[PDB]
Enzyme design. Structure first.
Site, PDB file in Angstrom:
ATOM      1  N   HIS A  41      20.558   1.818  40.938  1.00  0.00           N
ATOM      2  CA  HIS A  41      19.244   2.139  41.580  1.00  0.00           C
ATOM      3  C   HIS A  41      19.137   1.501  42.964  1.00  0.00           C
ATOM      4  CE1 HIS A  41      17.470  -1.414  39.361  1.00  0.00           C
ATOM      5  NE2 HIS A  41      16.959  -1.595  40.579  1.00  0.00           N
ATOM      6  N   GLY A 143      13.860  -8.215  43.255  1.00  0.00           N
ATOM      7  CA  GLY A 143      15.150  -8.567  43.878  1.00  0.00           C
ATOM      8  C   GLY A 143      16.146  -9.165  42.890  1.00  0.00           C
ATOM      9  N   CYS A 145      17.605  -7.722  40.218  1.00  0.00           N
ATOM     10  CA  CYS A 145      18.549  -6.765  39.610  1.00  0.00           C
ATOM     11  C   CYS A 145      19.964  -7.099  40.075  1.00  0.00           C
ATOM     12  CB  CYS A 145      18.190  -5.316  39.873  1.00  0.00           C
ATOM     13  SG  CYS A 145      16.710  -4.911  38.921  1.00  0.00           S
TER      14      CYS A 145
HETATM   15  C1  LIG Z   1      15.330  -5.204  40.057  1.00  0.00           C
HETATM   16  N1  LIG Z   1      15.474  -5.931  41.104  1.00  0.00           N
HETATM   17  C2  LIG Z   1      14.015  -4.974  39.323  1.00  0.00           C
HETATM   18  C3  LIG Z   1      13.718  -6.131  38.350  1.00  0.00           C
HETATM   19  C4  LIG Z   1      12.272  -6.158  37.824  1.00  0.00           C
HETATM   20  C5  LIG Z   1      11.207  -6.375  38.869  1.00  0.00           C
HETATM   21  C6  LIG Z   1      10.115  -7.158  38.156  1.00  0.00           C
HETATM   22  N2  LIG Z   1      10.874  -7.861  37.127  1.00  0.00           N
HETATM   23  C7  LIG Z   1      12.037  -7.296  36.850  1.00  0.00           C
HETATM   24  O1  LIG Z   1      12.813  -7.665  35.968  1.00  0.00           O
HETATM   25  N3  LIG Z   1      14.036  -3.697  38.629  1.00  0.00           N
HETATM   26  C8  LIG Z   1      13.081  -2.770  38.805  1.00  0.00           C
HETATM   27  O2  LIG Z   1      12.151  -2.905  39.602  1.00  0.00           O
HETATM   28  C9  LIG Z   1      13.182  -1.521  37.944  1.00  0.00           C
HETATM   29  C10 LIG Z   1      13.747  -0.360  38.734  1.00  0.00           C
HETATM   30  C11 LIG Z   1      12.655   0.693  38.860  1.00  0.00           C
HETATM   31  C12 LIG Z   1      11.407   0.183  38.162  1.00  0.00           C
HETATM   32  N4  LIG Z   1      11.842  -1.082  37.543  1.00  0.00           N
HETATM   33  C13 LIG Z   1      11.163  -1.828  36.663  1.00  0.00           C
HETATM   34  O3  LIG Z   1      11.637  -2.850  36.213  1.00  0.00           O
HETATM   35  C14 LIG Z   1       9.750  -1.393  36.290  1.00  0.00           C
HETATM   36  N5  LIG Z   1       9.720  -1.222  34.855  1.00  0.00           N
HETATM   37  C15 LIG Z   1       9.876  -0.010  34.330  1.00  0.00           C
HETATM   38  O4  LIG Z   1       9.970   1.012  34.981  1.00  0.00           O
HETATM   39  C16 LIG Z   1       9.988   0.061  32.810  1.00  0.00           C
HETATM   40  F1  LIG Z   1       8.826  -0.145  32.241  1.00  0.00           F
HETATM   41  F2  LIG Z   1      10.458   1.235  32.414  1.00  0.00           F
HETATM   42  F3  LIG Z   1      10.817  -0.847  32.328  1.00  0.00           F
HETATM   43  C17 LIG Z   1       8.634  -2.298  36.829  1.00  0.00           C
HETATM   44  C18 LIG Z   1       7.257  -1.699  36.500  1.00  0.00           C
HETATM   45  C19 LIG Z   1       8.771  -2.384  38.345  1.00  0.00           C
HETATM   46  C20 LIG Z   1       8.697  -3.717  36.248  1.00  0.00           C
HETATM   47  C21 LIG Z   1      13.911   0.996  38.084  1.00  0.00           C
HETATM   48  C22 LIG Z   1      14.861   1.997  38.727  1.00  0.00           C
HETATM   49  C23 LIG Z   1      13.785   1.168  36.585  1.00  0.00           C
END
Ligand SMILES: *C(=N)[C@H](C[C@@H]1CCNC1=O)NC(=O)[C@@H]1[C@@H]2[C@H](CN1C(=O)[C@@H](NC(=O)C(F)(F)F)C(C)(C)C)C2(C)C
Ligand SMILES: *C(=N)[C@H](C[C@@H]1CCNC1=O)NC(=O)[C@@H]1[C@@H]2[C@H](CN1C(=O)[C@@H](NC(=O)C(F)(F)F)C(C)(C)C)C2(C)C
Lengths: 305, 305
Positions: A41, A143, A145
């Site tokens: 992503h 940030g 991920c």
């Molecule tokens: C990567 N850097 C982040 C890590 C997240 C941010 C907040 N805490 C974490 O662990 N990953 C993301 O932002 C991913 C990314 C899009 C949305 N996302 C999510 O983690 C979201 N959750 C979801 O979509 C769900 F519910 F399906 F798990 C969010 C609402 C921002 C926490 C993608 C491509 C999934």
């Protein structure tokens, strides 16, 4: 003596963390030999993440569109491919700090160390269990991920987790290093739910052995049980079934303490039926299930790397 | 989101750990530039440790009597001296992995990461608080002495603890890197007692801020208190006095959440007087005091190194 939630020393993984940027989006990558592994992503705009077609987004990317930095040093990208939910960026430089490593898929109930990272820089290390519902109780911000989970066996780093997302109630989901999710999750920004977790029975028993080794023995009763009767009674408390494989991996702690596994199961049955009557076990008022039998042995006998 | 007990990444300290052997006795040393620092009881037989005269034992040692190993490599000892309870071994090789570092003496109530080591090899990392009674709740076995505690600020490692001994109830005592004990302990194998600990009030308040940031808000009441009335009420629960210095270091969390420090103190007063009525805060059934205000900010805003 003493019993603490303990992570593996992180150095071997710290020397593998890089920053990956594609357009506007930045996260962490893991640099091993001449490959960088990161969540796919990275190629998404925040809008693309709502309903991404990764194959379509990736066609329109070139090698040069991936900015990979190892501290101050840019690594030249010379090839790219997608494997499930991870990107592989071939770089022109092998990482001289690459440890001996393996990619492993961990089982539910098993633990690993997480090195939480931001912008390719390590921030902190903690221990997690892969829950039976295929989530981890982590600590991750924007940030994070591409942060990875791992175990160390002597010199060898077994990478088992790469971080992708946060679900409801602040729990975390991700992939193995082949990009396959743990659990029924997808890398799409749409509401997803973990669904019901269970208590890891074998780990609660491992921790009760830890407690005895540390001199906490008040919960030991004079009784035994059958595996059958234990599993019948424990089911109502949302404890997973204890299998003969689980009994086998408790054998070293059983042998060390001279407490049969089914004797400890009789003590656990009484704790589940009666509660702790205002007492603590290793300083906790709740039964702990994030220590494996191996975690107890390693800490209560001092394995090094 | 999520809130975990998190250690600093250990790599910068892992590259400083060596094995020190003098006769029969082996423990860990910390190699910085061309000096190795280790607990002085390396020069003791187990019999000497009952009532040691370190100055007398050290006169009868030569440089060559100290076997220092960095993995497989022996480091030649070219000088030795004692500073309080630590030995300094000058070696003929500067450690090429020496990070930017400082020796600091930490205050009671402050936290640090421990890298537990055996035979010069890192085994695990965990977080500890320096208790008000000058002990740490660690996890240490035979051969762990010379393991160090530290904090990392950007590139700079602040070493604050070196491990020497285990007291009753499995708690741990040691020195700063100038060899001065924390607390009224001596490096002699004779019964010693910690004496009465206290709850670190400012850290409990930091953790209640962490809980709110994570969405745990049931304990927030509609009341305020005076610092005076809070300290009067909290004294009976063996909480340390909350000072204006403590209120000042809570300012960033107060500002971030929009909850005044004395409003959170009113909520803490109600928890102390009434208990948790079978509820948890960040998954714990007990109030947690081993997170500093800085620990909460760093984790709940993602500082890296
Ligand atoms: C990567 N850097 C982040 C890590 C997240 C941010 C907040 N805490 C974490 O662990 N990953 C993301 O932002 C991913 C990314 C899009 C949305 N996302 C999510 O983690 C979201 N959750 C979801 O979509 C769900 F519910 F399906 F798990 C969010 C609402 C921002 C926490 C993608 C491509 C999934
Ligand atoms: C160093 N490698 C060990 C670390 C100990 C061993 C068990 N867990 C630990 O943290 N240090 C020692 O063995 C020191 C050493 C002699 C005795 N000792 C102790 O820790 C003992 N405790 C005490 O003497 C007491 F109570 F005063 F703290 C022991 C009974 C072995 C735990 C010296 C020179 C103090």
């Amino acid at each position: 003596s003493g019993f603490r939630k303990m992570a593996f020393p992180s150095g071997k993984v710290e020397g593998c963390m890089v920053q990956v940027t594609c357009g506007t989006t930045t996260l962490n990558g893991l640099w091993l030999d001449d490959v960088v592994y990161c969540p796919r992503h990275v190629i998404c705009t925040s809008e693309d993440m709502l309903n991404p077609n990764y194959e379509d987004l990736l066609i329109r990317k070139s090698n040069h569109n991936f900015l990979v930095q190892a501290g101050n040093v840019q690594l030249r990208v010379i090839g790219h491919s997608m494997q499930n939910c991870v990107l592989k960026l071939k770089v022109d430089t092998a990482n001289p700090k690459t440890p001996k490593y393996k990619f492993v898929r961990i089982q539910p109930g098993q633990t690993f160390s997480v090195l939480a990272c931001y912008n390719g820089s390590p921030s902190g290390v903690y221990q997690c269990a892969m829950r039976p519902n295929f989530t981890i109780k982590g600590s991750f911000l924007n940030g994070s991920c591409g942060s990875v989970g791992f175990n160390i066996d002597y010199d060898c780093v077994s990478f088992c987790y790469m971080h992708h997302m946060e679900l409801p109630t602040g729990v975390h989901a991700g992939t193995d290093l082949e990009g396959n999710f743990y659990g029924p999750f997808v890398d799409r920004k749409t509401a997803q739910a973990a669904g019901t977790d269970t208590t890891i029975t074998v780990n609660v028993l491992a921790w009760l052995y830890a407690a005895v080794i540390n001199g906490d023995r008040w919960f030991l009763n004079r009784f035994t049980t059958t595996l059958n009767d234990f599993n019948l009674v424990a089911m109502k408390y949302n404890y997973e079934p204890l299998t003969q494989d689980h009994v086998d991996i408790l054998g070293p702690l059983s042998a060390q303490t001279g407490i049969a596994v089914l004797d400890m199961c009789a003590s656990l049955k009484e704790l589940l039926q009666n509660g702790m009557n205002g007492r603590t076990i290793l300083g906790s008022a709740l039964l702990e299930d994030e220590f494996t039998p191996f975690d107890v042995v390693r800490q209560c006998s001092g394995v090094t790397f």
